[PDB]
């Protein structure tokens, strides 16, 4: 009833009832810094397992989040509308970057768990 995957691209999803949470990681926030802004989907878009929706330019920088499942955008986070911060704040928290209807729980297990994703870090 609450389902945390991870992708290649320093990002973790939030499955609890049919929507993922996503938000990039500690691992993200690291090389960024104190970002700018945030490029969040439409409330209503359809995405891939590998699809930028969820991009990230910073004082001078960008990062592709690429996102985690497909499925079909249904929130997103407009805290970091205002802060963009909030991924330093608490990466795994409330700097979340979207949400999304799950369309194929089967593929999550085809993701990365947390400490598998841990070790994915491990070997930059």
Not at 75 to 98: Q, R
């Amino acid at each position: 009833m609450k389902m945390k995957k991870y992708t290649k691209t320093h990002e973790w999803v939030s499955i609890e009832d049919k929507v993922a949470t996503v938000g990039i990681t500690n691992h993200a926030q690291e090389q960024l810094g104190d970002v700018v802004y945030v490029d969040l989907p439409e409330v209503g878009r359809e995405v891939k397992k590998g699809e930028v929706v969820a991009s990230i330019e910073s004082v001078k920088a960008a990062a592709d989040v690429y996102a985690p499942l497909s499925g079909k955008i249904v929130e997103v986070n407009e805290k970091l509308d205002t802060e963009p911060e909030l991924i330093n704040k608490d990466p795994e928290g409330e700097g979340w970057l979207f949400k999304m209807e799950i369309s194929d729980e089967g593929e999550l297990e085809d993701l990365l768990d947390e400490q598998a994703y841990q070790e994915f870090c491990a070997q930059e």
